[PDB]
Amino acid sequence: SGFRKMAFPSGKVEGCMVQVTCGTTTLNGLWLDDVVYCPRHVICTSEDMLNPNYEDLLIRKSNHNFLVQAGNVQLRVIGHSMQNCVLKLKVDTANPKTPKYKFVRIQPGQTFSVLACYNGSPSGVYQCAMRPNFTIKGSFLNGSCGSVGFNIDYDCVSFCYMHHMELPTGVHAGTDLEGNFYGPFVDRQTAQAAGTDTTITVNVLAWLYAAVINGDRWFLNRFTTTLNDFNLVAMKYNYEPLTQDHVDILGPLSAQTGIAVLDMCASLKELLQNGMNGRTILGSALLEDEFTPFDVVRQCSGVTFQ
Amino acid sequence: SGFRKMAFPSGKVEGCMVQVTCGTTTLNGLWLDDVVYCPRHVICTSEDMLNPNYEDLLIRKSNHNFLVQAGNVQLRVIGHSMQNCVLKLKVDTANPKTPKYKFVRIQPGQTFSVLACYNGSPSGVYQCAMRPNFTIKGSFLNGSCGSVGFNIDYDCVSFCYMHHMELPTGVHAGTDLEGNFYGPFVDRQTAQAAGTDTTITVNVLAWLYAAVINGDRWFLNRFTTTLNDFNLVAMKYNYEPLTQDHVDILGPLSAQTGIAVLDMCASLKELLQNGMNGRTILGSALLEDEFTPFDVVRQCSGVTFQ
Ligand SMILES: O=C1C[C@@H](C(=O)Nc2ccc(Cl)cn2)c2ccccc21
Ligand SMILES: O=C1C[C@@H](C(=O)Nc2ccc(Cl)cn2)c2ccccc21
Ligand code: NA
Ligand code: NA
Numbered sequence: 385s386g387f388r389k390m391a392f393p394s395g396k397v398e399g400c401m402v403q404v405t406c407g408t409t410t411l412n413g414l415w416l417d418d419v420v421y422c423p424r425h426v427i428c429t430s431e432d433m434l435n436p437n438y439e440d441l442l443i444r445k446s447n448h449n450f451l452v453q454a455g456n457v458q459l460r461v462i463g464h465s466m467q468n469c470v471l472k473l474k475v476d477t478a479n480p481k482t483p484k485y486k487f488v489r490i491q492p493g494q495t496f497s498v499l500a501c502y503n504g505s506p507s508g509v510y511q512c513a514m515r516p517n518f519t520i521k522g523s524f525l526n527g528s529c530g531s532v533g534f535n536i537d538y539d540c541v542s543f544c545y546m547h548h549m550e551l552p553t554g555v556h557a558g559t560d561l562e563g564n565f566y567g568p569f570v571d572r573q574t575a576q577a578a579g580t581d582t583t584i585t586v587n588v589l590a591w592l593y594a595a596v597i598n599g600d601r602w603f604l605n606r607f608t609t610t611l612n613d614f615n616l617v618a619m620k621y622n623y624e625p626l627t628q629d630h631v632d633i634l635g636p637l638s639a640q641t642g643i644a645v646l647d648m649c650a651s652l653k654e655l656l657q658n659g660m661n662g663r664t665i666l667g668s669a670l671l672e673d674e675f676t677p678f679d680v681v682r683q684c685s686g687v688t689f690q
Numbered sequence: 691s692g693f694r695k696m697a698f699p700s701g702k703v704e705g706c707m708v709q710v711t712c713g714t715t716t717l718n719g720l721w722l723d724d725v726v727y728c729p730r731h732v733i734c735t736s737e738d739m740l741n742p743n744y745e746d747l748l749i750r751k752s753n754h755n756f757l758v759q760a761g762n763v764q765l766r767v768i769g770h771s772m773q774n775c776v777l778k779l780k781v782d783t784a785n786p787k788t789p790k791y792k793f794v795r796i797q798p799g800q801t802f803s804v805l806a807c808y809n810g811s812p813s814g815v816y817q818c819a820m821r822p823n824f825t826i827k828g829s830f831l832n833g834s835c836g837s838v839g840f841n842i843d844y845d846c847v848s849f850c851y852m853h854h855m856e857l858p859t860g861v862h863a864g865t866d867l868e869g870n871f872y873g874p875f876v877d878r879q880t881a882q883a884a885g886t887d888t889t890i891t892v893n894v895l896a897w898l899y900a901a902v903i904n905g906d907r908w909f910l911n912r913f914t915t916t917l918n919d920f921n922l923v924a925m926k927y928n929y930e931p932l933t934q935d936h937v938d939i940l941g942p943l944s945a946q947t948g949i950a951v952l953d954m955c956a957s958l959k960e961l962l963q964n965g966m967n968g969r970t971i972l973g974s975a976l977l978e979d980e981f982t983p984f985d986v987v988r989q990c991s992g993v994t995f996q
């Protein structure tokens with residue numbers, strides 16, 4: 385028992401981190417097979433970042449201008465190409481530590497682990513959600529660009545995120561591993577609007593199930609609701625509308641606890657309208673939305689990786 | 691910017707986890723050099739756990755009764771000994787993945803990362819504190835015993851915790867790597883009192899500094915206090931008394947922010963007496979005490995490991 389914001393074990397990803405330097409910019413790269421992936425803004429100078437012409441800046445660079453170091457050891461660059469907002473540096477050595485891996489584009493509301501890195505060296509690991517407005521609320525200082533997000537399924541690492549920028553509002557934006565930003569963002573040092581954000585309702589409900597499984601039960605009430613009634617309350621409180629697909633994903637947790645999904649919605653309605661009256665749920669005084677239903681079952685069932 | 695509950699990168703520890711089986715009990719072990727360390731209750735049957743005679747149970751076991759597996763591969767056991775509440779199984783092979791390491795006994799209020807494991811395979815990593823009453827509020831299911839806690843300093847892993855038990859109250863107890871419990875606990879399935887717990891005041895103050903560094907400033911006020919005055923408030927709200935040693939440890943954060951430690955104490959006093967009026971600090975609606983002053987500086991300065 386107990387419920388924590390748990391990250392995936394980071395070792396399979398730590399073996400893939402490298403340092404990339406171009407001119408006077410150092411950031412992180414991801415070395416899989418004979419390719420290093422990194423944010424294309426490694427080729428920018430401080431001036432360049434207000435409105436970079438990436439095609440023109442990259443034409444000034446040759447293979448030998450990209451310095452790639454894997455711990456103590458220098459890699460030899462034999463090709464470079466830009467795909468969307470990422471650079472792909474072909475090197476003459478396959479990474480001997482390459483895990484089984486996939487590149488995935490995650491949906492808003494899904495979770496992943498971030499391995500925060502500086503100068504190609506890991507500093508820490510934490511779990512977060514892709515917000516509905518395609519930002520992440522991370523922990524990233526200058527030099528963290530090229531840090532990656534990921535999920536693991538037994539022995540397979542699914543890379544979903546590469547860090548590119550901190551917006552002036554102090555939230556974070558980045559790409560998939562094909563270099564396509566999540567959300568409307570561009571790799572320019574400019575004020576950039578993020579959507580209105582919303583709370584990930586299906587995740588809050590998953591976490592309430594987690595709370596019940598752990599014996600935190602005070603918020604369970606005598607009430608039920610409908611999808612239509614609940615969703616009127618969701619709109620008022622800037623929660624994502626609940627769909628039958630979300631109900632179906634919550635099926636296993638409903639079966640484990642014997643609490644019908646709409647009964648748990650009625651509990652959440654009362655918590656939205658009345659607050660928590662200075663009480664806590666799983667150590668939190670807020671409704672938590674960074675656990676997916678899959679996360680709660682994995683944590684509550686002791687699933688492992690190799 | 692941003693502030694997250696960040697764990698240490700787990701790869702150096704993942705290479706050390708093994709499965710240990712004795713009779714019909716499987717749990718985790720830690721393989722460093724030619725020794726595997728694991729909870730001595732691996733030798734207990736379900737009956738045994740109400741009041742085990744560990745000396746008598748271990749006399750019935752020979753080297754060949756301890757099955758130790760490192761991934762797919764079986765290790766050969768050439769000796770066994772009990773040190774306090776841990777078993778040390780000498781094996782005929784040094785772990786080729788052994789990192790630079792130390793065994794440390796941490797103080798209450800210090801933090802560490804836990805690598806939660808089942809059947810010798812890592813499931814997840816999270817950060818927590820040793821509570822003042824020497825429990826931890828973890829996430830541990832049956833089979834997690836022998837999972838370990840640790841800190842990293844560049845290339846050196848300091849192992850501080852081995853998981854042994856879930857108390858009937860659903861909090862967690864374990865030992866240092868010499869097998870000495872933290873707190874009054876014994877490895878028996880019995881109701882066992884934990885102290886009165888208290889909030890780790892120096893950690894709350896560190897986190898308030900973290901909040902200021904990140905621009906969350908609403909709780910800063912016009913007031914100051916004294917150590918004696920603050921500590922009267924600490925007692926009322928079950929906070930650890932603040933000492934000049936704690937003030938000195940907070941020196942760097944005070945210098946970085948230009949907020950005198952006693953001025954930050956006056957902010958914390960007002961938050962204790964008035965609550966947070968439905969506001970948040972670094973995404974939390976509670977005062978957070980699982981970040982040490984060293985944690986806040988490391989996170990806010992991008993310190994890395996290798
Ligand atoms: O989280 C981060 C990443 C880094 C950042 O935003 N850098 C960057 C670099 C190029 C362009 Cl075109 C835009 N932004 C940064 C600097 C200071 C603090 C945080 C962060
Ligand atoms: O966190 C844990 C560890 C495990 C546990 O307490 N097992 C154990 C085994 C032997 C003795 Cl003498 C006492 N306790 C457990 C079982 C169920 C749920 C959680 C946990
Ligand atoms: Na970029
Ligand atoms: Na983004």
Ligand code: NA
Pocket residue numbers: 729730731732775776854877
């Ligand atoms: Na034990």
Ligand code: NA
Pocket residue numbers: 824825826862863864865871872873875
């Ligand atoms: Na303990």
